[PDB]
Design a protein around this nucleic acid. Structure first.
Length: 88
DNA sequence: AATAAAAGGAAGTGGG
DNA sequence: TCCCACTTCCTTTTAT
């Protein structure tokens, strides 16, 4: 069972869905979602988990906020911008 | 100004 | 039965 943070890391590490998510600084671990195409990346995540309802970015973002300010993925005060931990 | 994003409480869910 | 790791629903609060 793949976790949400690993799924996102794998996408960026493999250059998958580059129009939906992209690194902002690979060294600092910061990445950013696509304001226009983020919902298509969100749906993929819902399929890998086989949820009953359709996955939305709002729901994926609700899951990301659970990791916390020192956890796997953290929120950065920039639009649609997050950051991985030193596990890079 | 309108829109998008961000937030989060709390129950609900399948996994182990 | 117990968490884990989200999922779902909803309303509220900020940023763009």
């Amino acid at each position: 069972k793949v976790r949400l943070y690993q799924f996102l890391l794998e996408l960026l590490k493999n250059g998958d869905m580059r129009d939906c998510v992209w690194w902002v600084d690979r060294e600092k671990g910061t990445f950013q979602f696509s304001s226009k195409h983020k919902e298509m990346l969100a749906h993929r995540w819902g399929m890998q988990k086989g949820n009953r309802k359709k996955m939305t970015y709002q729901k994926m973002a609700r899951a990301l906020r659970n990791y916390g300010k020192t956890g796997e993925i953290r929120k950065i005060k920039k639009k649609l911008t997050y950051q991985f931990d030193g596990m890079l």
